[PDB]
From a paper:
Presentation of antigenic peptides by major histocompatibility complex class II (MHC-II) proteins determines T helper cell reactivity. For MHC class II (MHC-II) molecules, which typically reside in late endosomal vesicles, the noncanonical HLA molecule HLA-DM (DM) acts as peptide exchange catalyst. The MHC-II proteins HLA-DR, HLA-DQ and HLA-DP are heterodimers consisting of a highly polymorphic β-chain and an α-chain showing little (HLA-DQ and HLA-DP) or almost no (HLA-DR) polymorphism.
Although these complexes cover a range of thermal stabilities between 64.1 °C (DRB1*07:01) and 87.3 °C (DRB1*01:02), they all show essentially the same three-dimensional fold. Thus, these CLIP-bound allotypes apparently occupy the stable ground-state structure with CLIP bound in the same canonical orientation and register. For all analyzed allotypes, CLIP was predicted to bind with its canonical core motif (MRMATPLLM). Interestingly, all allotypes retain the capability to sample the same conformational states MS3 and MS1, but CLIP affinity and pMHCII stability alter the occupancy of states of the individual allotypes.
Residue numbers in the entry:
A (entry chain B): 31 to 223
B (entry chain E): 1 to 15
C (entry chain A): 3 to 181
Amino acid sequence: GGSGDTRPRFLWQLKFECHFFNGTERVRLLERCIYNQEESVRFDSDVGEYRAVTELGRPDAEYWNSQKDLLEQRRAAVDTYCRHNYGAVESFTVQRRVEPKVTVYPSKTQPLQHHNLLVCSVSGFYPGSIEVRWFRNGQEEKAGVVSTGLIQNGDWTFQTLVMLETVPRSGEVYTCQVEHPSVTSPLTVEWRA
Amino acid sequence: PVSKMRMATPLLMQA
Amino acid sequence: EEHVIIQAEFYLNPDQSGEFMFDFDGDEIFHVDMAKKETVWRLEEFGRFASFEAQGALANIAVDKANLEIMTKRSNYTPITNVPPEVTVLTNSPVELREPNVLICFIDKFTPPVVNVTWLRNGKPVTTGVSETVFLPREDHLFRKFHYLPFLPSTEDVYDCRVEHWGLDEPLLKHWEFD
């Protein structure tokens, strides 16, 4: 932060996590209460009451668990909250599919030498599950491949770079192959050596 | 027909 | 486990800052602007399919504040330990000269959720077209945040994302220039 402030800070975080397995078929609710980055007390629908996570949360677990009307509202939340919200948003979240744009450009591991790195850029896709493969003359090259890994852009899209280190020879055809749930058949982009 | 999302409400601690 | 929806709220003292958001598999569905009492959908199209009554978020934050003040006293006023962010600058897509692009400043793994962020172009602050996210949750209960700067690539411009946080000794400047 700014303000030139040394004053001590105190933070309280609350998380209601709805975990879905095969859609709404199996649902688990975890309520986490967190003081200064340490979870202190938790409601787990697999249990049906609060449990203290640190001793600082013990008074709350004891007090809330004595209030059976509050427990019964939490115990129903897998239905009244988790399953409800799943149906409200599934069409634009669970079902969201955005096709990646794929480009290839040459690069260098050593700046003073020749192009020896083929970069497959795969950007703008959703969801994050993706498979990227490099081919040379129709045959996969698994050696010499490095990647950024999966990068979350913060705007419901992902990107990645997948790079192949190789010495291009005349006549070779290098092709990046991308598989993703948004497309029926793989996307391919070539680079001619 | 827009779907209405629900919120869960924190429990109040004893003061 | 296919999917996780998280309602994540927080209250921070003495700043009296409180936030309320929903997360799906790591992306923000919406948050509530406390000051405007407004549901802000992360993508505008979401509000075509769903709605949320923002006023309920303010009632939640009031309880969170009360509970925070009870927990603070109960802890004998033990304060949070600052965790400084790690900062990454990247672009939305591979960079091409005078093809519009977006710089992304990704601020990660920090707490408390307070930062001062400035984009600098050639050492000078830029605010045109910038945007940002609220403070996003992590499983270790630290925070994430994204800042964005549309830009037109040029060999003559250099950029820094400057991040200030109480866990840092000095402002953190993460550099970016056209390779």
